[PDB]
Structure 1
Amino acid sequence: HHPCCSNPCQNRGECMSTGFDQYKCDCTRTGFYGENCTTPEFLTRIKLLLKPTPNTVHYILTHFKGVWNIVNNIPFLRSLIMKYVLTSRSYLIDSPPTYNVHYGYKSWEAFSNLSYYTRALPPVADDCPTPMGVKGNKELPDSKEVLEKVLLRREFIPDPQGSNMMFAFFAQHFTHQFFKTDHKRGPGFTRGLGHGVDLNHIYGETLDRQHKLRLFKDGKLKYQVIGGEVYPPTVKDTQVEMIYPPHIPENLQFAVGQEVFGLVPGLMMYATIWLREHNRVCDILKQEHPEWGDEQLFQTSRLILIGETIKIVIEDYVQHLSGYHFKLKFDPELLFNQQFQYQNRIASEFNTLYHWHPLLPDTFNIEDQEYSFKQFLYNNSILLEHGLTQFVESFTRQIAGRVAGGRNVPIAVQAVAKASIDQSREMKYQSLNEYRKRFSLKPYTSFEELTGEKEMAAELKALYSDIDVMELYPALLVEKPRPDAIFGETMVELGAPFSLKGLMGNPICSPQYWKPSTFGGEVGFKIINTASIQSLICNNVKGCPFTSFNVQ
Structure 2
Amino acid sequence: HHPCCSNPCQNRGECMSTGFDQYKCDCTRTGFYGENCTTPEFLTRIKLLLKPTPNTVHYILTHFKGVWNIVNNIPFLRSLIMKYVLTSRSYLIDSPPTYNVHYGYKSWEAFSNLSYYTRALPPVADDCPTPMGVKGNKELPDSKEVLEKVLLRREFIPDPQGSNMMFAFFAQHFTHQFFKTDHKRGPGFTRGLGHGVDLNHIYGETLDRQHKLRLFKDGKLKYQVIGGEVYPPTVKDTQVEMIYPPHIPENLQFAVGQEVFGLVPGLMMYATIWLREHNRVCDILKQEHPEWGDEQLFQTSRLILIGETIKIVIEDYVQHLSGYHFKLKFDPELLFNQQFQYQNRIASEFNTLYHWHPLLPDTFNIEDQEYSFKQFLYNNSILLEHGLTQFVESFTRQIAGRVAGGRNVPIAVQAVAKASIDQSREMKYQSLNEYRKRFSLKPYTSFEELTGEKEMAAELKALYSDIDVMELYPALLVEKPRPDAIFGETMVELGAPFSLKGLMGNPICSPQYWKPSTFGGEVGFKIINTASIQSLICNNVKGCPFTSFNV
With structure 1 as the length reference, what TM-score do the two structures score?
A: 1.00
Query: In structure 2, how many angstroms separate the alpha carbons of the residues matched to 1:90 and 1:167?
Result: 24
Per-residue CA distance 1:77-102 (angstroms, 9 max, x = gap): 00000001001101100000000000
2:349 aligned partner:
349
Per-residue CA distance 1:355-378 (angstroms, 9 max, x = gap): 000000000000000100000000
1:189 aligned partner:
189
The 3-state SS of whatever aligns with 1:118 is coil
The 3-state SS of whatever aligns with 2:387 is helix
Deviation at 1:207, TM superposition (A): 0.1
Per-residue CA distance 1:272-310 (angstroms, 9 max, x = gap): 000000000000000000000000000000000000000
Deviation at 1:142, TM superposition (A): 0.1
1:393 aligned partner:
393
Per-residue CA distance 1:122-141 (angstroms, 9 max, x = gap): 00000000000000000000
The 3-state SS of whatever aligns with 1:342 is coil
Runs of 4+ displaced beyond 2 Å: none
Per-residue CA distance 1:243-293 (angstroms, 9 max, x = gap): 001111111000000000000000000000000000000000000000000
Query: In structure 2, how many angstroms separate the alpha carbons of the residues matched to 1:388 and 1:145?
Result: 41
Deviation at 1:520, TM superposition (A): 0.2
Query: In structure 1, how many angstroms separate the alpha carbons of the residues matched to 2:246 and 2:301?
Result: 35
Deviation at 1:528, TM superposition (A): 0.2
2:174 aligned partner:
174
Query: In structure 1, how many angstroms separate the alpha carbons of the residues matched to 2:423 and 2:134?
Result: 20
Deviation at 1:521, TM superposition (A): 0.2
Query: In structure 1, how many angstroms separate the alpha carbons of the residues matched to 2:372 and 2:72?
Result: 42
Per-residue CA distance 1:352-402 (angstroms, 9 max, x = gap): 000000000000000000100000000000000000000000000000000
The 3-state SS of whatever aligns with 1:225 is strand
Deviation at 1:159, TM superposition (A): 0.1
Per-residue CA distance 1:33-69 (angstroms, 9 max, x = gap): 0000000000000000000000000000000000000
The aligned length equals 551
Query: In structure 2, how many angstroms separate the alpha carbons of the residues matched to 1:362 and 1:313?
Result: 26
The 3-state SS of whatever aligns with 2:362 is coil
The 3-state SS of whatever aligns with 2:2 is coil
1:112 aligned partner:
112
Per-residue CA distance 1:453-508 (angstroms, 9 max, x = gap): 00000000000000000000000000000000000000000000000110000000
Per-residue CA distance 1:504-530 (angstroms, 9 max, x = gap): 000000000000000000000000000
Query: In structure 1, how many angstroms separate the alpha carbons of the residues matched to 2:251 and 2:329?
Result: 41
2:366 aligned partner:
366
Per-residue CA distance 1:140-188 (angstroms, 9 max, x = gap): 0000000000000000000000000000000000000000000000000
Deviation at 1:196, TM superposition (A): 0.1
Query: In structure 1, how many angstroms separate the alpha carbons of the residues matched to 2:460 and 2:74?
Result: 48
* 1:454 correspondence with 2:450: no
Per-residue CA distance 1:407-437 (angstroms, 9 max, x = gap): 0000000000000000000000000000000
1:281 aligned partner:
281
Per-residue CA distance 1:329-353 (angstroms, 9 max, x = gap): 0000000000000000000000000
Per-residue CA distance 1:220-243 (angstroms, 9 max, x = gap): 000000000000000001000000
1:475 aligned partner:
475
The 3-state SS of whatever aligns with 1:389 is helix
The 3-state SS of whatever aligns with 2:136 is coil
Query: In structure 2, how many angstroms separate the alpha carbons of the residues matched to 1:388 and 1:523?
Result: 27
The 3-state SS of whatever aligns with 2:442 is coil
Tell me, which stretches of 5 or more residues in structure 1 are unaligned?
A: none
Query: In structure 1, how many angstroms separate the alpha carbons of the residues matched to 2:245 and 2:111?
Result: 38
Per-residue CA distance 1:173-222 (angstroms, 9 max, x = gap): 00000000000000000000000000000000000000000000000000
Query: In structure 2, how many angstroms separate the alpha carbons of the residues matched to 1:341 and 1:383?
Result: 41
Query: In structure 1, how many angstroms separate the alpha carbons of the residues matched to 2:519 and 2:244?
Result: 36
The 3-state SS of whatever aligns with 2:267 is helix
Query: In structure 1, how many angstroms separate the alpha carbons of the residues matched to 2:67 and 2:90?
Result: 26
RMSD: 0.2
The 3-state SS of whatever aligns with 1:100 is coil
Query: In structure 2, how many angstroms separate the alpha carbons of the residues matched to 1:47 and 1:113?
Result: 37
1:414 aligned partner:
414
Query: In structure 1, how many angstroms separate the alpha carbons of the residues matched to 2:518 and 2:113?
Result: 30
Identical amino acids, percent of aligned pairs: 100
Query: In structure 1, how many angstroms separate the alpha carbons of the residues matched to 2:164 and 2:512?
Result: 38
1:256 aligned partner:
256
Deviation at 1:72, TM superposition (A): 0.4
* 1:151 correspondence with 2:155: no
Query: In structure 1, how many angstroms separate the alpha carbons of the residues matched to 2:78 and 2:392?
Result: 31
Query: In structure 2, how many angstroms separate the alpha carbons of the residues matched to 1:312 and 1:395?
Result: 18
Query: In structure 2, how many angstroms separate the alpha carbons of the residues matched to 1:107 and 1:117?
Result: 14
